[PDB]
Design a binder for this molecule. Structure first.
Ligand SMILES: Nc1ncnc2c1ncn2[C@@H]1O[C@H](COP(=O)(O)OP(=O)(O)NP(=O)(O)O)[C@@H](O)[C@H]1O
Ligand SMILES: Nc1ncnc2c1ncn2[C@@H]1O[C@H](COP(=O)(O)OP(=O)(O)NP(=O)(O)O)[C@@H](O)[C@H]1O
Ligand SMILES: Nc1ncnc2c1ncn2[C@@H]1O[C@H](COP(=O)(O)OP(=O)(O)NP(=O)(O)O)[C@@H](O)[C@H]1O
Ligand SMILES: Nc1ncnc2c1ncn2[C@@H]1O[C@H](COP(=O)(O)OP(=O)(O)NP(=O)(O)O)[C@@H](O)[C@H]1O
Ligand SMILES: [Mg+2]
Ligand SMILES: [Mg+2]
Ligand SMILES: [Mg+2]
Ligand SMILES: [Mg+2]
Lengths: 362, 337, 265, 48, 119, 337, 360
């Protein structure tokens, strides 16, 4: 399920059928990740191959109405509304409708899965559904659980999220994929509900405010984000050049923590620091701009095989588009193979190798 | 400056001021009434919920003097008051009265309405005050189990619609200075620009005591403010966020243990930080210095110059409590004598 | 501000305050050891340099910078690198050899193509002549020492314990030594390269004295710095202790309420 | 060694089981390293 | 006052100093000519009327001053109450190294060593 | 490698796998099934208690392909499922459903069983979800009053007796990574061998995520494994414990400021940390590295060797994600090439 | 109460009638401490003299039956069963039984107390008894407090442990000693139950997995363990060669972080004793030492006869010293075992025998 988000599609690759949590504090970019994913499907939905298509269902739970508005506008500004279904249980509606929406929605997109197609359900967001489900119960007078929630607030979510699955051939191969959202407080993931859902899903993407304000956007936390399906759902080409990146990026935080001692570095640590800094920077991405795989691939390859390592950090911005501009212009025949084939054959690694070096010498 | 630059307010949007006791939500709002409400033309609806009657008596003096309220003339504003002496029913309601009035001016008389609520917290606090006697099992932190939807009914009404614009500033109180308390936590999702007051920042004597890192707005987007204002913003934040990351090493080891690049960022961030403070005309009886109003184009340039280090050679103090970049070069010449 | 966090947060500070307090006391003993080598070197500076006082020798510049590789000792390197740039204004194109990395790192950032050689593995133990000769030797070797119009060593002089001082001192070479006003008074037999030696050995000796003084000025700094670290982490501990008890306390009340409410129903 | 050091080989051949209690045994062990520096970039490492 | 090793400084009033100069032994006295000389690797001695106390040395510099103070500086240094087999076993390894820039340093050892044997 | 060296599992024993979410419990338990459940002469039950319907799906398709199941012939395992897609009552009894099938082979087929439960924490949780509806006052951390005795009443049936032997592997969810959470905290008393997976470990890329210090097994006693095994196992532990203790001084004063024995202890501890990881067969999707299985005698010998320094020259990376000391040498050279 | 454990007998001396609390996190060694006390009574229980024997009572609360079974199979393997009683209230039994067992067993102990004899009683554990009491109360819908325990959870444990005592001559002078086990969670002594119990007992033996993985077993935190009874309950002889031991190990805890290059000979020395001393108090399981076997080792330690020996050899030191002392000095050992005190002569005897073994 290609999101077109460099950080996500190389680090936490999401699969048709899997449930994947988006969790972080308020105002961190949770909705933004979900949105940028939807926008991307244009690539396939304006085609005619029904089995490459991904229909989106966006569930608004406890959002204010104008905010659902502001959002359908953007979907339309991107001709993205023709393949979506928003289901809204806004702030003002009855607690029962809020609690219900995700279930009703799950069914709307279950139609797609049952019928040979693939939907994508975004639950934005479960923290509120539980707030409301708490409200029915306390008022129905059922005795409360922890933080006044009902006893089976877990069962609540578990049964919804299990409804996402990737059917077998006998059953039509339809998938339903879930991106629930969850809002924490003060970064605490050890609070009731997040804990519940965290263990229900096939991995999480943690967004962080600290990361954000120092310029990593998506403010994904590689350290903590996982996709438990893993490489099974990555594109072969992306997989090939992303070999070890996520582990490496960890080692990078490692050496950068030891850097705080401000004691002299050797040629090994300075080496991985230079690359990690550039890799970090290479994954930064503007909102509303999902990238094709073949745009992603050469970027990642340039970073990983260290062709970026002798280039100013402020300039990596300009590298990205200037690179892509040139690759489209000249070696378009590669870009179109990567796309068509999804797998870098040995000669294609060659052409790409040549192609990158070429350009780095301006 | 802090708002203009970092979290731009939006015409016909929902603004909210967050802060604990005595950080300055009331004085901040009075600065907004000061600027916008004068050169606005259209109608205002001020609503005092659960605040001091002193303050309300002061605001009625304040208007008759600027001429917003003219007992013998016409008038641009309206006053509704369920103050902190009222019983919880009164206070659980008085804001809905304000709203109804504004909603008329919006939908019937198709007007631009400026709608100041202070303090909206005091509506949800009243809700809890009565809730147990209404027979309800309490909820986390001892709030009415309906706290979210009772807010959704009220907040979802304060809005721009296809029949009339409403800009609204609301004062948000923050119990025990805890931002995660379930009253303010739930508010946020109802606003379009959120600007938070830190107690700590006021104890630094920085006013407005905004949190440059916690304040947000939907309008800080290049498509709206434009690449430069966009970038002067981010880079300012990176600077401040870095200063923040080091708060610990500097706390124990102090400055001498920082590297060279780090060291600069801190001296720069401490300047940016002081520069974000601004004298307010309304708060004059607290600074002493007559208040200043900087412009948007003014602010961005000013900060950009500092971020290009074009002022590094100026004592940090110069940046404190003055207007735009011109005022910095002034005060620094004054002190260098 | 959960309890889990605050606890471990408060631990790792106690653990820091421990280390910093060890540091301080360890410097105290190390400064006693390097006190005796700053009296035995600043005395050999007496017998040596007195000859130069009588034959008053007045001096492509060679600046030698002295510190260590060690951080965690305040502004030793920071403010020595500044006096080296203050003097590096009046000759933008003067060669530097640096002893200790922290100074090299400092200047490498500001006069990046001034430096031609660098030494390391220094401010660990008290410096010895054996080193002071090998560096003097390599300064003669690759650096072409005598063939320099002028040479000055830059070091941190120790004024007390609480304060040090960035300082400079002149090395004079073979020609300067012959040419010195009162050289005539000294019936030094022109019997083969005699001023040369005096130079080659005033380069090692002067260098030593500087290093002895530099190290003993650094140790003082390390001591004082580590000392303040202990005071701060001391004060931090106090704060977090208070915060800990609050959180504990509430953890008890909020936990309890959950039960009370469950129980009334 | 040198002349600069002449009297540090005459003092270290003349170093080499008595006075060598800490003092001199350590005066004999120096752990220094030099490295030449070129156009930023270095040259190579070697023991003093 | 004036006779220093870098690690250990020694002497202070003197009636006769004997030194192993650049060109052969010399003796400074109550009033002497101001002179500088390289100090060769050999024995030295102080005097205080009729007081005999001889040291060995590595080498360095002597400097008789106009103000009449003699300054003597060397690196390493009691007479036979300091330095036989310690010398012998080392002399072996010394001569061995000479047959080897590296063996040039051993040349320095032979002369320094051979000298010490005489004590 | 780490189990058989440090906390070796007991035939007839009970064996819990503690771990917060996604630290590798389910993968681990499957690696066990991959190995143990072939070499095992008898029968095996697997219980899925409140896990992911799809995990179960995989198992049923693996069983067929490992051969352990055969829908047109002989099969060596029974499958009992009650995943989280199911209501508390159901999730609260399916453990006993599975457990009974085991019991029957134990007592009436008079033979060896292997009882796999994933995940036993959901038996306690499900108990939790209906407790209040049955009208019980909540106990601490909002767990049911009957936690202790309910767990007791189940766990005590899962047991080797004179009629026959059960050997059980139960994954234990550790909520919020908190081991002192009433639920897991209770389970400890029930197990012969405890394998503690750790996020800190797993975050280093060290799989399985086993904590070498906090893992324990009663069988680590000279009387059971011999002295040498016990001595190696103790020293490996001392090593890592020291290396853990020194991580303060390494952060603050670098690796520089260390005793020489210490410098070596750390060198050896790091080499050892890595030799404790190992590619699982099951987890090929994650490492793309072929599954390596190591013989218990090969484990002890290689660690013995490592410990006496007979490998101090080989680089750290050569011990990481490989099988026996053969593979350390093989990799050492392959990389130096 | 001589436990056989060097660390405990020497540094945390237990008296008869006392209530010493065994406390630590899970898997630290709590049961091992108790069990070695029990295993060490053969010395007297096999003898004749009543006033000198000690009967064991092990109250098992909410333990896996297979554990209990094995704890049985362990005392029978040391011939300790013959003088021990196991009251079993295993994991799976009704809460009332788990609530009752310790009082039930308490009254079993008092039999011996009341009859001029001496028992000692191990409560393994009180944590789980409190959990049980809780279950009953909540279900009976008695009102809950902190952590959902009833008000009288204190009163529960006070009643239990106040029953332990040394009775006066008029009462037959019998005695009952108490070893309650308390299980901390992540080390939390402020935790509700540990608070109550700590404030009832006469002290604690404190265990820590940290010390445990270091290899210091028993894993006794010395700095945290106290016995309010203390001095008064110590083989005068062991107390003779160890008034210095708490002193040395105190100062060794304070100069410990100095273990990382330039230390002055005073604080160097302090680190020299400490390591050796700490080493000397390691003790494999199930092998408790006779007093006359402790006092020599603690003597050679405290009076500096191990500073010469390397730290790894302190292992084989103990073994070889004691077997040598047995053959060549069985007479001094005999006097210690019999007199229970040390003559000015005996001090020169041991000194001489040590200096002889240390030289050899
Ligand atoms: N890649 C990006 N670059 C720049 N801004 C971004 C990016 N992603 C998100 N944002 C911005 O950050 C702001 C809040 O992001 P948002 O996507 O609403 O996160 P959120 O967790 O859903 N906040 P909320 O749900 O309202 O508490 C929006 O104004 C976005 O413009
Ligand atoms: N041996 C291993 N090698 C590589 N990755 C592993 C290994 N074990 C676990 N992982 C990673 O960790 C993830 C979670 O594994 P998993 O066994 O599902 O964790 P878990 O603790 O059982 N999840 P849960 O059952 O909710 O507690 C996987 O998707 C793998 O990426
Ligand atoms: N911008 C400012 N300039 C100077 N002083 C300020 C400013 N904002 C707040 N203060 C000071 O802080 C105090 C409290 O400000 P106020 O506007 O009453 O804040 P508030 O947070 O609305 N307090 P409250 O309404 O009781 O919860 C005032 O007396 C001012 O002195
Ligand atoms: N002195 C010792 N030497 C060696 N091993 C020991 C010693 N004491 C305890 N052990 C071992 O360490 C483990 C822990 O001891 P144990 O008596 O179970 O402590 P505990 O507090 O009772 N653990 P538990 O009560 O089961 O949570 C056991 O497996 C013993 O085999
Ligand atoms: Mg959102
Ligand atoms: Mg106010
Ligand atoms: Mg799992
Ligand atoms: Mg036990």
């Amino acid at each position: 399920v290609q999101t077109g988000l460099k950080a996500v599609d190389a680090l936490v690759p999401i699969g048709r059928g899997q449930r994947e949590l988006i969790i972080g504090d308020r105002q961190t970019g949770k909705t933004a990740v979900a949105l940028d994913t939807i926008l991307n499907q244009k690539r396939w939905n304006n085609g005619s191959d029904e089995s490459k298509k991904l229909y989106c269902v966006y569930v608004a739970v406890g959002q204010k109405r104008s905010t659902v508005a502001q959002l359908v506008q953007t979907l339309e500004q991107h001709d993205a509304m023709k393949y979506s279904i928003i289901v809204a249980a806004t702030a003002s509606e009855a607690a029962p409708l809020q609690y219900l929406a995700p279930f009703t929605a799950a069914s709307i997109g279950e139609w797609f899965r049952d019928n040979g197609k693939h939907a994508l359900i975004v639950y934005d967001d479960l923290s509120k559904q539980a707030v409301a489900y708490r409200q029915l119960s306390l008022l129905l007078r059922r005795p409360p659980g922890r933080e006044a929630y009902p006893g089976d607030v877990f069962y609540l979510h578990s049964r919804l999220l299990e409804r996402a699955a990737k059917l077998s051939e006998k059953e039509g191969s339809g998938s339903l994929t879930a991106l629930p959202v969850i809002e924490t407080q003060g970064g605490d993931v050890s609070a009731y509900i997040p804990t519940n859902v965290i263990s229900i899903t096939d991995g999480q993407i943690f967004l962080e405010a600290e990361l954000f304000y120092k310029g990593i956007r998506p403010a994904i936390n590689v350290g903590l984000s996982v996709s438990r399906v893993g490489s099974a759902a990555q594109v072969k080409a992306l997989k090939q050049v992303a070999g070890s990146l996520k582990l490496f990026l960890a080692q990078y935080r490692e050496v950068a923590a030891f850097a705080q001692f401000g004691s002299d570095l050797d040629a090994s640590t300075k080496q991985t620091l230079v690359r990690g800094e550039r890799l970090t920077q290479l994954l930064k991405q503007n909102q509303y701009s999902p990238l094709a795989t073949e745009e992603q691939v050469p970027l990642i390859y340039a970073g990983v095989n260290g062709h970026l390592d002798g280039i100013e950090l402020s300039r990596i911005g300009e590298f990205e588009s200037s690179f892509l501009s040139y690759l489209k212009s000249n070696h378009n025949e590669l870009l179109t193979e990567i796309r068509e084939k999804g797998e870098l054959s040995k000669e294609l690694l060659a052409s790409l190798k040549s192609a990158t070096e070429s350009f780095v010498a301006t | 400056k802090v708002v203009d630059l970092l979290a731009p307010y939006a015409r016909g949007g929902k603004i909210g001021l967050f802060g604990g006791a005595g950080v300055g939500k009331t004085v901040f709002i009075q600065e907004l009434i000061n600027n916008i409400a004068k050169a606005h033309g259209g109608f205002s609806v001020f609503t005092g919920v659960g605040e001091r009657t002193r303050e309300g008596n002061d605001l009625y003096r304040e208007m008759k003097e600027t001429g917003v309220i003219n007992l013998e003339g016409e008038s641009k504003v309206a006053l509704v008051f369920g103050q902190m002496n009222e019983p919880p029913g009164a206070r659980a309601r008085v804001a809905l009265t304000g709203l109804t009035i504004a909603e008329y001016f919006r939908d019937e008389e198709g007007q631009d309405v400026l709608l100041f609520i202070d303090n909206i917290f005091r509506f949800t606090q009243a809700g809890s005050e009565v809730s147990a006697l209404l027979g309800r099992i309490p909820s986390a932190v001892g709030y009415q189990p309906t706290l979210a939807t009772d807010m959704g009914l009220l907040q979802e009404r304060i809005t721009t619609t296809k029949k009339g614009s409403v800009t609204s500033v609301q004062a948000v109180y923050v119990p025990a200075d805890d931002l995660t308390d379930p009253a303010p936590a739930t508010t946020f999702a109802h606003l379009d620009a959120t600007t938070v007051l830190s107690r700590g920042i006021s104890e630094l004597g920085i006013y407005p005591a905004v949190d440059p890192l916690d304040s947000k707005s939907r309008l800080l987007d290049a498509a709206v403010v434009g690449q430069e204002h966009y970038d002067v913003a981010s880079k300012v934040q990176e600077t401040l966020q870095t200063y923040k990351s080091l708060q610990d090493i500097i706390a124990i080891l102090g400055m001498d243990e920082l590297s060279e690049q780090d060291k600069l960022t801190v001296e720069r961030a401490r300047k940016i930080q002081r520069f974000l403070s601004q004298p307010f005309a309304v708060a004059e009886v607290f600074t002493g210095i007559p208040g200043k109003l900087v412009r948007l184009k003014d602010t961005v340039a000013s900060f950009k110059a500092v971020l290009e280090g074009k002022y590094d050679n100026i004592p940090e103090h110069a940046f404190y409590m003055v207007g735009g970049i011109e005022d910095v070069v002034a005060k620094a010449e004054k002190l260098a004598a | 501000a959960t309890l889990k966090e605050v606890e471990m947060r408060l631990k790792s500070i106690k653990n820091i305050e421990k280390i910093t307090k060890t540091m301080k006391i360890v410097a105290s003993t190390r400064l006693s050891k390097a006190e005796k080598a700053k009296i035995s070197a600043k005395k050999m500076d007496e017998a040596e340099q007195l000859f130069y006082k009588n034959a008053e020798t007045k001096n492509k510049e060679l600046i030698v910078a002295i510190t260590s590789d060690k951080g965690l000792c305040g502004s030793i390197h920071s403010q020595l690198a500044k006096a080296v740039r203050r003097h590096l204004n009046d000759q933008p194109n003067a060669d530097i050899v640096t002893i200790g990395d922290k100074i090299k790192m400092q200047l490498l950032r500001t006069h990046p193509n001034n430096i031609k050689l660098s030494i390391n593995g220094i401010g660990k133990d008290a410096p010895t002549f054996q080193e002071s000769a090998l560096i003097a030797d390599k300064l003669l070797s690759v650096m072409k020492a005598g063939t320099y119009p002028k040479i000055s060593i830059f070091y941190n002089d120790p004024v007390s314990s609480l304060s040090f001082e960035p300082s400079e001192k002149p090395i004079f070479n073979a020609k300067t030594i012959e040419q010195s006003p009162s050289f005539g008074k000294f019936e030094i037999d022109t019997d083969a390269n005699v001023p040369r030696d005096l130079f080659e050995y005033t380069l090692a000796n002067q260098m030593l004295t500087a290093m002895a003084q530099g190290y003993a000025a650094e140790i003082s700094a390390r001591r004082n710095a580590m000392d303040n670290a202990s005071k701060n982490a001391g004060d931090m501990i106090n704060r977090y202790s208070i915060l800990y008890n609050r959180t504990r306390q509430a953890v008890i009340t909020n936990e309890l309420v959950d039960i009370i409410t469950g129980a009334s129903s | 060694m040198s002349y600069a050091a002449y009297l540090n080989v005459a003092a270290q051949a003349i170093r080499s089981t008595e006075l060598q209690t800490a003092s001199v045994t350590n005066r004999s062990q120096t752990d220094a390293f030099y490295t030449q520096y070129k156009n930023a970039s270095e040259p190579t490492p070697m023991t003093k | 006052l004036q006779f220093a090793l870098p690690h250990e400084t020694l002497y202070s009033e003197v009636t006769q100093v004997n030194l192993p100069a650049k060109s052969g032994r010399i003796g400074v006295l109550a009033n002497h000519v101001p002179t500088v000389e390289q100090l060769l690797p050999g024995v030295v001695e102080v005097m205080e009327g009729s007081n005999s106390k001889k040291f060995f040395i590595s080498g360095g510099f002597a400097t008789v001053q106009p103000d009449s103070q003699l300054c003597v500086t060397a690196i390493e240094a009691p007479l036979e109450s300091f330095s036989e087999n310690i010398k012998n076993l080392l002399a072996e390894a010394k001569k061995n190294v000479s047959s080897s820039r590296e063996a040039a340093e051993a040349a320095i050892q032979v002369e320094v060593l051979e000298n010490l044997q005489s004590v």
